[PDB]
Amino acid sequence: SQSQGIQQLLQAEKRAAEKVADARKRKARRLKQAKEEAQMEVEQYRREREQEFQSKQ
Amino acid sequence: EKKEKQIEQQKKIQMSNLMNQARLKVLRARDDLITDLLNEAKQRLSKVVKDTTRYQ
Secondary structure (H helix, E strand, O other): OHHHHHHHHHHHHHHHHHHHHHHHHHHHHHHHHHHHHHHHHHHHHHHHHHHHHHHHO | OHHHHHHHHHHHHHHHHHHHHHHHHHHHHHHHHHHHHHHHHHHHHHHHHOOHHHHO
């Protein structure tokens, strides 16, 4: 039954690999979203300061 | 900040140019007044010249 043992273990290894790859994919996506949101805040700040400048000008 | 420096510099530097030109404007007006006097003096001297008894 040596092959059944390893069959079960390699399938478990497969599942673990899928789980961590998916977690890494989530990380990559979250980090991209994080950059997009940061940039959105940067644009909000830009618009606010640009508006004060033009008002004062 | 750079923009502010630009606008603030213009606000000082534009008023400096305006005040400097205002100074030149009144100075030129003062010189015109001096010229008018001298041109009147020339006409007054001519009137004296027309008087034989003083011009001779």
